[model samples]
Target: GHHHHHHSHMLRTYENKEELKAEIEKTFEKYILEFDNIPENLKDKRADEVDRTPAENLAYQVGWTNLVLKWEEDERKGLQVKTPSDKFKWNQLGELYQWFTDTYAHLSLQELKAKLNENINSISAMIDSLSEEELFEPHMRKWADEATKTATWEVYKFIHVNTVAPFGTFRTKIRKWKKIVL
Candidate 1:
């Protein structure tokens, strides 16, 4: 059954680095603050198998952005790049999510917040420094094209899906959880 209907509204592509950067900020600003404000008592609550506490969620973001950074780094070094990780497959992302939480389990919420902010800055600066051609052109990132046939524009789409879309949705999830639990 081919039930893969395209969601046209979510197929967003950024034409330039500035547009991408602005959207990143717009999506990230409030969500970052909200994650930091999540009370300690509520930080451990997971609503479902797919959802996580605010702290785990931020760590999840850190893990994925850092994954991008690593891929870029390895590609620049002319080395073979692994998608996700050598230990995990594309369909095994749920396992990778667990890896993120387990790997960062030592960090307190305050430290996690600080680390998440640092990661946001790092990823933002990386995106901001790209030329328009570098941002929008196909095959700019060797690993992305190799792994997903994603041009730089599509890379931004992937980034936004994980960043902008989830931040808004998770903000709603957290608020609802708080309403019912608090």
Candidate 2:
């Protein structure tokens, strides 16, 4: 029996892991296209109007995927979970991103991208591990419940919102940056 839950502005297009992975890879392809002919050292350099350096953007992707994983990990341990961070709230994510940049400051752009690739693989694997019922069911995960106020109860919505929703804008940002730098 299908039950209608509270619907908000948020929506979920992925019905299963394959759908999610397809979108993830499709977005990633566009993101990677911006790197063509881009120099390694240049990716760390950002223009005055740019929101983040290339490495920083990669780090941002890495940070978010890991944050989702951490939420699940912490919840399993019965530890208290923070939405974005204990030190920063959702609206204050710009400031919190500094922590990500600082933490990965030593890594080269390639290194940061490699790390993101690993996390992407992990995300795919984690998605595959969950049953469709678990992935789409409401209140199956604590973070899903906590962050899903205006959305469906499905955890896949959380993942898609965090990853797929922002990639189009990011892909454009990176493309415009390459036009300037490359």
Candidate 3:
């Protein structure tokens, strides 16, 4: 009789928003727990002081570089993505490009962390100084043009929105990654 029942014929059912309350609790925990580390990571990232595994370093560059291209493409008509070299058509600061080409060198992780630490504060401070408007201005492109090859606050933020670190990124993660450790 249970198998013949109308409700039983359906495979799934929604609760009366009862379980939804638990869902909210789960969501809060996920984000709040993750966000606390963001400030520190940003501080470190800005200062160029992050210590990452070789894989971690690559993730960082790829993640940041995509964000850079997206931000620039969405804002200015002339971003660093343009180049006579054609190979430079997009943000070249990504982890894949940077790591693969030895831009930062394949030194041990600690050394890379040390290198970034020296400049994190300066970079974050410059990036922090740009008024939201200066950050988005037509003339800002001129400033970026002068130094796209180097790390700049503008460039970093632009690259920041694309991926997650084994740590985390500023751009929100819309969905949780599927677990594989089971």
Candidate 4:
């Protein structure tokens, strides 16, 4: 039995921008579908075994997706960029998660889902605008380089982690929550 529960790993690499964008869309579609089965009444209901409620899961995605876009925009405009956000440090992710919940949890599930979709679309546009070299070449973006001080990551990798990677893991999380509660 494959009993490992770690789903955060990025096992696939994209050779071109189209592949990356397709993966983002595919994973996001499946992730968002999981939320469709969750009723508005139980959006905030928490399962003890899962880390995020359905509402919180959407909030988390909106937060990170927007942050990733902001990083790229800031860099393009020659502004000083902050990894994650100015309000939160990389090590303060727990607090960041709470910020996502607190800031966005009040919105209805549909609202949260719409916000995530908008951000994902913007991300896709950003990918569409970048060249193959810019997307896959390490040390191409200062924001990404600054984020990983020791190890370098291509821009596509950062995009993958924020978009495709988390969508898969969070889909499993929401699925488990639904099984227990619904």
Candidate 5:
């Protein structure tokens, strides 16, 4: 890459495997150490027990193998699985992916979470009887090219047209969402 070529040019040097690994570790410190806590409800699940170990390379390989066992075709095929996506769904999913990269990359995780929570609360309250299961259902899918923000934008557009207030008015507008049991 640019680093490999540049380092090779400078002092006629390039990173060996160890030096490359060190650099990668340094660059990824924030996430490598704190890539979000596994949510509380899942803390005692089977996956959590395995995840508690140090993430060495061999550990990663074994972890991958376990994951294949856990969710592979031989296991959860049509069991509890939901929508699966690939190239066929890319058109519907693309815009959302791009928008999320653009928008979410600009916000802190807490801010992004709060913004999404607020938006969802408004929509859920307005809908009157949406279940958490329904909201998170696989059928509530975005096009591969869709920017999730586009769905948010639709709500904004609706409010503007209907002249509804965006935030607080009354009637207690936060719907409780579900947390899956592991």
Candidate 6:
């Protein structure tokens, strides 16, 4: 029987950067490990009833990881930052997913996995470079505030949604595909 998407993990709050960082590490590790079970030949082959193939899933993660890092980097450089991306509006998420597939899904599963690992490491370092106030205080970053429209989210919230939250969800997705296709 199909159940609604679980969101208990999505609402998780982190008291400090350390806790958030650890969660990111744990979730990312588990998510990346799931790719190991996906055979290379089937990386791009859509599993029956699955929304995305294994390669597309990894690409999606990589796309968001890069975008999150880009927001911070652009802000630091005094450049205007765009949410999601310059070309894609927040409401155009379907197109953004397609863009991710077109841009990164061409890479082999091994390459995609390595790229994601590198990006995750970079994000971890980025988190380490931020302070409690910078991460947890609302409206700390203009880009994040601008992205959320309401400016209710702190830098960490952006980081959490893009990394830990989606990592857990996508891990389950890949596992499901493995169950059906492996």
For candidate 2, the per-residue lDDT at 153 reads 50
Cα lDDT, model 6, residue 150: 38
Per-prediction TM-score to the true structure, in the order listed: 0.81, 0.83, 0.34, 0.92, 0.23, 0.92
Q: Model 3 misses residue 139 by how many Å?
A: 6.2
Give the candidate order by descending lDDT: 4, 6, 2, 1, 3, 5
Q: Per-residue lDDT for 1-182 in model 3, tens only?
A: 11221112222222423232233234334533432333222322221232332334433433333334444444455544432123433434343444433545344444443543333333344445455555443346442453344333333223122211212331132112111100
Per-residue lDDT tens digits for candidate 4, residues 58-148, read 9988988888899999999999887778897777777888998999987899999999999989999999898888889987888887766
Error of 2 at 41 (Å): 1.6
Model 5 regions lying over 4 Å from their true place: 1-92, 129-182
User: What are the lDDT scores of the predictions, listed in order?
Assistant: 0.65, 0.70, 0.34, 0.84, 0.27, 0.83
Clashes of 4: 0
lDDT of 2 at 115: 73
Instruction: For model 5, give the 10-residue run with minimal summed lDDT.
Output: 169-178
Which pairs, if any, clash in model 6? Answer: none
Name the runs in model 6 displaced over 4 angstroms: 1-9
lDDT of 5 by residue, 13-59 (tens): 21232332233234333222232443333322333223222112112
- Please identify which of the two predictions, 2 or 3, would achieve the higher TM-score against the true structure: 2
Worst lDDT 10-window in candidate 1? 1-10
> Model 6, residue 163: displacement in angstroms?
0.9
